Amino acid sequence: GIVDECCLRPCSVDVLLSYC
Amino acid sequence: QQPQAVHTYCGRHLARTLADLCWEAGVD
């Protein structure tokens, strides 16, 4: 669930870049 | 307040995010 991660708290690129 | 970034999204907008990042991380 990446939604409850960016919707709820930060996840700016330096955090999403890690989801891939 | 439009800070540096926080608005974020929820659902879908996220399935498009890792589609643009894995894309900028190296479309290869």
From Swiss-Prot, chain A:
Disulfide bonds join C6-C11. It comes from the Eukaryota. This is Bombyxin A-2 A chain. It comes from Bombyx mori. The lineage of its organism: Eukaryota, Metazoa, Ecdysozoa, Arthropoda, Hexapoda. The gene is BBXA2.
Swiss-Prot record, chain B:
This is Bombyxin A-6 B chain. It comes from Bombyx mori (Silk moth). The gene is BBXA6. The chain holds residues 21 to 47 of 92 of the full protein.
